[PDB]
Symmetry: C2
Subunit: 462 residues, 2 copies
């Protein structure tokens, strides 16, 4: 039992892993972006049981490095063009290492008071960038889903009671992230009472159809209580009409929550900050640091304009008076604080702006290309496009684009996935890697066009 907490075998394995991993960090370019697992790999894991007797440490570590951690998308590779695993700074890694070492937590007791002070300082700073100048509040959460549910609960407790909750209705767009409707169900709003407002050609929420749905629901006897606008859509990086939405909310006595899990980072970019004008109008906003603030999963934030709303929703005593929904938390904000102090907000701002440039470069490289359609132009480091030769009908065009995705993934040169946009299968690129160059974007596009016409000629008909 004296070798449970600490042993020399462990102390060595830790130092060895850190050393080895730092060394392998310098040969990321030589490695494929995405390594895929074979179909027998799952059973290989399921056949390792939870043993009664312990195993030698480095034997288990090697097993995890080879059989578990190996099969992933390296988000720290410049040509990993997805954003769900975000590029993770080693400053953030260091934050995790220290926080886990000291074994401390946020909230809960008062044994670690400075932990909460650190997090509070960050949340205050983030409040400034959003546009909350009055008396804001906030809490660190594990992700956007948790950020969304936290805000929507505050929204619900602020607008509805237990006897009219069944009459409450919520409003989102068809490009709104799925966690929002999911979170709405959890707090008591049925899917039948969650309106999916259509979007522009620019994928922004149609505020005209929004108001129509609001007046109709109000007339039916329902109680419209919240509109969720997205600042940085998952698919296209589009932004809902923030001022227009806020106007309707003030008019119809509705809570305005902005889902800025991805796009809220743009506030740190002096060049593109103006795109999120009116975030300070919202009553609450979500923000993930593991997306565009270069953190490891998971470090996300939710901010409210009036802190009294978080108290009314999440206080412990006397249940009628950060917090919520957790009591004791992992010290998530500590690694973000460390990142801010070491890198500074200017540098982080510059990195975000480089993300915009990468998408633009992808579009500029796609323009001369023949039969390449731009479904969504370069917007907030994102771009959606497809190879659509006139010869192939609708169905075989979608299959073509999917085959292109598989072809480049197997090549291990870049990570590009397919998303359904406007009814058609579309290739998507989200480039936010700080060290990605124009050559990276150019060659990738050139490699995509190559695969595009390779599979094109493979359509031997009939």
């Amino acid at each position: 039992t004296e070798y449970i907490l600490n042993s020399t075998q462990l102390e060595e394995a830790i130092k060895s892993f850190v050393h080895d991993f730092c060394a392998e960090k310098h040969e990321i370019h030589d490695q494929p972006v995405v390594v895929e697992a074979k179909e027998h790999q799952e059973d290989k894991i399921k056949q390792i049981k939870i043993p009664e007797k312990g195993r030698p440490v480095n034997e288990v570590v090697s097993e995890m490095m080879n059989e578990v951690y190996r099969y992933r998308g390296d988000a720290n590779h410049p040509r990993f063009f997805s954003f769900v695993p975000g590029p993770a700074s080693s400053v953030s890694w260091l934050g995790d290492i220290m926080t886990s070492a000291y074994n401390i937590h946020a909230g809960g007791s008062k044994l670690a008071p400075m932990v909460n002070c650190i997090e509070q300082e960050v949340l205050k700073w983030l409040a400034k960038q959003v546009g909350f100048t009055e008396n804001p509040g906030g809490v660190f959460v594990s992700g956007g889903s948790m950020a969304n549910i936290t805000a929507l609960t505050a929204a619900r407790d602020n607008k509805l009671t237990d006897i009219n909750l069944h009459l409450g209705t919520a409003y989102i767009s068809d490009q709104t992230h799925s966690s929002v409707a999911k979170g709405l169900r959890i707090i008591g709003i049925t899917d039948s009472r969650i309106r999916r407002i259509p979007t522009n050609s620019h994928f922004q929420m149609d505020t005209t159809k929004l108001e129509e749905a609001i007046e109709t629901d109000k007339k039916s006897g329902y109680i419209p209580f919240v509109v969720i606008g997205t600042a940085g859509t998952t698919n296209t990086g589009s932004i809902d009409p923030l001022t227009e939405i806020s106007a309707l909310c003030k008019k119809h006595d509705m809570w305005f929550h902005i889902d800025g899990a991805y796009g809220a980072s743009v506030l740190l970019s002096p060049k593109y900050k103006s795109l999120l004008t009116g975030t300070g109008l919202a009553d609450s906003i979500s923000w993930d640091a593991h997306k565009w603030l270069f953190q490891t999963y998971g470090c996300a934030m939710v901010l409210v304009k009036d802190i009294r709303n978080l108290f009314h929703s999440f206080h412990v005593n006397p249940e009628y008076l950060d917090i919520g929904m957790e009591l004791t938390r992992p010290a998530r904000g500590l690694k973000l604080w460390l990142t801010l102090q070491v890198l500074g907000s200017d540098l982080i701002g510059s990195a975000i702006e480089h993300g915009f440039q990468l998408a633009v470069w992808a579009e500029e490289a796609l323009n001369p290309k023949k039969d390449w359609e731009i479904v969504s132009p370069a917007q907030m480091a994102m771009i959606n496009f497809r190879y659509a030769p006139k010869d192939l009908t609708k169905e075989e065009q979608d299959i073509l684009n999917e085959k292109i995705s598989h072809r480049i993934l197997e090549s291990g040169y870049a990570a590009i996935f397919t998303t359904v946009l406007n009814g058609k299968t579309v290739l998507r690129i989200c480039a936010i890697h700080p060290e990605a160059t124009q050559e990276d974007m150019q060659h990738t596009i050139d490699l995509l066009d190559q695969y595009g016409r390779e599979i094109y000629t493979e359509m031997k008909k009939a």
Copy 2:
């Protein structure tokens, strides 16, 4: 921008911290259990701003180590007799380092499939220990709070509709953790509809008064839908009558959820496993690994007997079909798996049993002591006791017990805090440190008795 993700200054700072921390791990005994911060320390943190220009890494590192991380309760000290910060194995630390290094996540996408395979293997194994043999399900959560709300949301969707949700009532004891009632509010159950059933002298839920409240509420027109039994109360480690409660739930069509954030680990102890007979009767159960599975915050699990109930509450499409409430999660289960593989379940079991022995040793040392009352006997590594000389009245007895707590904390020899139990201030000991000895328990009690009569004689009246 090329020094955001990685730099030599960072690679050195990482290797330096890990190396230095492992070295200081050999002098934990020489250090005080709790280091308390002065009243100027908060301002010392608030005066450091979020800089636009980056700071040198080790300057920031030293700052956090000295001004932030320094002020904490060392849970890895054998005489830290609280459990909220649990004793953290370095295997768990290693798990954190690896998980953060590879920058991977659970759920979400299909880029890291073996991560989910690993977590699922653990959850299946944990299901076996609870008694879910039919078709169970589960998801890793950030803590007990998240485990409770996940299960209670499942409870609600299974028993109530949107128009009678306001009529639903829940039933807990006066010893049930505060996160439970808080979570009930979040999913739509107001505090006025959360019944606090009184407890025995053994601090177990009175199943007789429970049925009375159920029949009364049923007659009033309310809809009793869930009872939350606790397997291992925060204060005394008491266990509610699991079979009695389950019987009532089957009879009255109610969901049975067990809060085993702390006590569910006892299932791993072959000696004391029988104390949790009937856990398999519940429809859901919570379980924290950062409490008695020697993990860092936060690593917790929630299990349900019927996985379909979790699907009905947390599915994404078509919202009428792990998961919930999160989509993408930190790979929390990976560090638990590493711990399980390295230490084995037998060794973990032995440590738990050693926790029991420590509490027993505290009681055995307290029996000969005069004027020391045992409010709660050694139960699940917990014991509650007080120094109550007949000379001092009720109020000054409580003040006495609080001063003893302060006296031993300032000495830095042990961490013992006060809890209110049966209306009176009481010293509480939770000893779960795998390397704590009988001398540790004996000297602690002897030191308390010393301080007890020291403050006693300081009551110079009148």
